[PDB]
Design an enzyme around this catalytic site. Structure first.
Site, PDB file in Angstrom:
ATOM      1  N   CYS A  51     -14.210 -19.726  81.247  1.00  0.00           N
ATOM      2  CA  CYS A  51     -13.022 -19.998  82.041  1.00  0.00           C
ATOM      3  C   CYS A  51     -11.943 -18.921  81.945  1.00  0.00           C
ATOM      4  O   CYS A  51     -11.014 -18.941  82.754  1.00  0.00           O
ATOM      5  CB  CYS A  51     -12.437 -21.349  81.638  1.00  0.00           C
ATOM      6  SG  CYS A  51     -13.432 -22.764  82.250  1.00  0.00           S
TER       7      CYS A  51
ATOM      8  N   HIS B  43      -4.844 -20.697  84.348  1.00  0.00           N
ATOM      9  CA  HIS B  43      -6.086 -21.425  84.511  1.00  0.00           C
ATOM     10  C   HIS B  43      -5.850 -22.923  84.280  1.00  0.00           C
ATOM     11  O   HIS B  43      -5.405 -23.319  83.193  1.00  0.00           O
ATOM     12  CB  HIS B  43      -7.157 -20.927  83.552  1.00  0.00           C
ATOM     13  CG  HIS B  43      -8.429 -21.691  83.682  1.00  0.00           C
ATOM     14  ND1 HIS B  43      -9.267 -21.540  84.764  1.00  0.00           N
ATOM     15  CD2 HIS B  43      -8.964 -22.671  82.918  1.00  0.00           C
ATOM     16  CE1 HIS B  43     -10.280 -22.376  84.651  1.00  0.00           C
ATOM     17  NE2 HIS B  43     -10.121 -23.073  83.539  1.00  0.00           N
TER      18      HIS B  43
ATOM     19  N   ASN C  88     -12.051 -27.794  88.439  1.00  0.00           N
ATOM     20  CA  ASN C  88     -12.183 -26.650  87.543  1.00  0.00           C
ATOM     21  C   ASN C  88     -13.362 -25.798  87.994  1.00  0.00           C
ATOM     22  O   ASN C  88     -14.509 -26.067  87.628  1.00  0.00           O
ATOM     23  CB  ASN C  88     -12.361 -27.105  86.099  1.00  0.00           C
ATOM     24  CG  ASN C  88     -12.455 -25.938  85.117  1.00  0.00           C
ATOM     25  OD1 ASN C  88     -12.546 -24.774  85.508  1.00  0.00           O
ATOM     26  ND2 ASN C  88     -12.420 -26.254  83.836  1.00  0.00           N
TER      27      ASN C  88
ATOM     28  N   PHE D 203     -15.624 -30.077  86.193  1.00  0.00           N
ATOM     29  CA  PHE D 203     -16.236 -28.852  86.710  1.00  0.00           C
ATOM     30  C   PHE D 203     -16.561 -28.978  88.191  1.00  0.00           C
ATOM     31  O   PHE D 203     -16.865 -30.068  88.693  1.00  0.00           O
ATOM     32  CB  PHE D 203     -17.509 -28.496  85.933  1.00  0.00           C
ATOM     33  CG  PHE D 203     -17.270 -28.171  84.473  1.00  0.00           C
ATOM     34  CD1 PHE D 203     -16.011 -27.786  84.025  1.00  0.00           C
ATOM     35  CD2 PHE D 203     -18.300 -28.273  83.548  1.00  0.00           C
ATOM     36  CE1 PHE D 203     -15.781 -27.507  82.691  1.00  0.00           C
ATOM     37  CE2 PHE D 203     -18.087 -27.982  82.210  1.00  0.00           C
ATOM     38  CZ  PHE D 203     -16.826 -27.598  81.779  1.00  0.00           C
TER      39      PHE D 203
END
Lengths: 375, 375
Positions: free
Chosen positions: B150, B289, B322, B201
């Site tokens: 990530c 992020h 994500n 995800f």
């Protein structure tokens, strides 16, 4: 100034196998003794390799404890990962420690780390493991170069050049670490290309310190990285493929990989040396990834290279086998050593300019132009 | 001058899952409706994520055809590779074509390519597939950034800065492409951190063009990359791990992850912005992020950021989930679009300097200092 190699070292697992003994040991450990035709087919591969010995962390004892690695296509990735993920930064640290010692500076001056391996992927990666094992600064700038195969020894030089030249005072530790854990498998008549790899692949690690603007009082240059190129070869799609699967890393080859590389090598030489005004390929020193022996035979004949232009490259192949990305760095190490022992005028066998070649999947050719250093 | 972002585009698979309906859909498609207490945990995770929708190339039809992917630890890597290795450059090409079109210059002017994915490794890599799919010059200088997780959205900017600033006229195409194929799996009592991945995800790709010294008459700067740091966090070893196993990519996450990032982020800010003369973290524009929502909440609380500082970062998380490395690049794209439409003074929310944060394994923090562009 130019990115400059300030130190080179290598490391191999202590376990060493004589190539003349390997066809018998390999076919014994993989319970293939009855495959008489295949065994002699493998023997010729080993004998044609011109490899004398290879270092392998994989021992008879480890393979008996992980028997699915001995089948051709056993479900075995987990067992291979368990071994290689520890070994890769371990062998890498062994090389790095020696390179840092040659360099003579505190490891706290290392600003960047390039780690390169095709022997197993993990999160966090081998770069993190090496950082922690070495005690590098937590703020070290890391680049993790995973699964790029046998051209990545030149790739790491290409990357280091831009890293060091764009960051004043930067000092980059490069570490390539490779092994046969993911590719070792039993033989099979229908996968001759995998058999080629069992005859060639070996373990090894190489480490470098690279930086621009050396301090002549404390640092000793070995080579300057002048330029670094990369190209894909026309019509070569699918020639070399490596797949990461449930059975580990499986290698797949097309028929004429040597022909592609020999037929295209002069284009890369021309593109790289025209800006230096050099057209005579015997007037530069050579480092060429030797893990495919017929590649070097055919390049040397296609170009008309004097017979010893590639002696250093073929010597590392003889003593160590195809260590993938580490090979070309092993060869740089030997060349500067040999040149000092023999009193040559430069680290480039007395010549001022040299080429370093990485060959690998995609058919990719990496071309690095090097400048020697005097005596 | 500085490396400069000149175009940004994104792409997602057309298939979309509404997060309000996902606990029911997921426990039904994994034949796990009887795990009522685990399902309630998963409902809480999905709601607290603040995700509204995610794009996933994995359809129920593909899952039916690949049932070992719906087990928790079924032998499934080969099936996942078969899907993802095609999907990663395909989605990446969709984003790249758009970014090259925005840029407006011939793709033959692209000198470097950086590909980044954690969705599956292959030899040759996704950088190779993209090069062929796009028809880039065979001499394009490629860097393949595999399995960095990530934080790698920042890593690719750190890399592109050195490539473009050290090579006059260079133009780097950057492509991040991520998906859930390696991580999708059925639920289990004893492995609840893997549930977190199932709630968060998602799939997505982002592409950028980056170069130094832009040609004002044909190129349009969006952000300048001022500096790029990377650090490991103290005592955080093992807090996030991802393993590539026979069952695919398994995730392992500790409850203290957000506390590590929030307790250490201000040192990254001081180190990055003391050279700029800035100490007010509300005075800079933020790209962080967002794939770990609690990280942002605790960072926000720790530094005393106004709730609007992270609005753009949380909005991308809301609309896409994500997407690993792609998230911060989506956020940059959206931020310049919002600023254009709202008539703000700069592409950085009207502010001059900004920070982009990647978070991931090692515990690693990537800190990229940005400068906005006026209108």
């Amino acid at each position: 100034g130019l990115a400059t190699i300030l130190a080179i070292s290598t490391a191999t697992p202590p376990n060493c196998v004589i190539q003349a003994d390997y066809p018998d040991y390999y076919f014994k450990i993989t319970n293939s003794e009855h495959m008489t035709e295949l065994k002699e087919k493998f023997r010729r591969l080993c004998e044609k390799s011109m490899i004398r010995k290879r270092h392998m962390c994989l021992t008879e004892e480890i393979l008996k404890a992980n028997p699915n690695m001995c089948l051709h296509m056993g479900t075995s990735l987990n067992a291979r990962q368990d071994i290689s993920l520890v070994e890769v930064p371990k062998l890498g640290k062994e090389a790095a420690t020696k390179a840092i010692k040659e360099w003579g500076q505190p490891k706290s001056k290392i600003t960047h780390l390039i780690f390169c391996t095709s022997a197993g992927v993990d999160m966090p990666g081998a770069d993190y493991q090496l950082t922690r094992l070495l005690g590098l600064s937590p703020e070290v700038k890391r680049m993790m170069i995973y699964q790029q195969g046998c051209y990545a020894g030149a790739t790491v030089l290409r990357l280091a050049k831009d890293l060091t030249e764009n960051n004043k005072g930067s000092r980059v530790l490069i570490v390539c670490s490779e092994n046969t854990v993911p590719t070792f498998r039993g033989p099979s008549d229908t996968h001759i290309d995998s058999l080629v790899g069992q005859a060639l692949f070996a373990d090894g690690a190489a480490a470098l310190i690279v930086g621009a603007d050396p301090d002549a009082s404390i640092e000793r240059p070995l080579y300057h990285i002048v330029s670094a190129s990369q190209t894909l070869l026309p019509d070569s799609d699918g020639a070399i493929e490596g797949h990461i699967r449930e059975a580990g890393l499986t290698v797949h080859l097309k028929k004429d990989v040597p022909a592609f590389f020999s037929a295209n090598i002069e284009k890369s030489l021309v593109d790289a040396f025209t800006p230096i005004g050099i057209s005579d390929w015997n007037s530069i020193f050579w480092i060429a990834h030797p893990g495919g022996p017929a590649i070097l035979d055919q390049v040397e004949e296609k170009l008309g290279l004097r017979k010893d232009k590639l002696k250093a490259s073929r010597h590392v192949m003889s003593e160590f086998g195809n260590m993938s990305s580490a090979c070309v760095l092993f060869i740089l190490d030997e060349m500067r050593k040999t040149c000092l022992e023999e009193g040559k005028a430069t680290t480039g066998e007395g010549l001022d300019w040299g080429v370093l070649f990485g060959f690998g999947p995609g058919l990719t050719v990496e071309t690095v132009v090097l400048r020697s250093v005097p005596i």
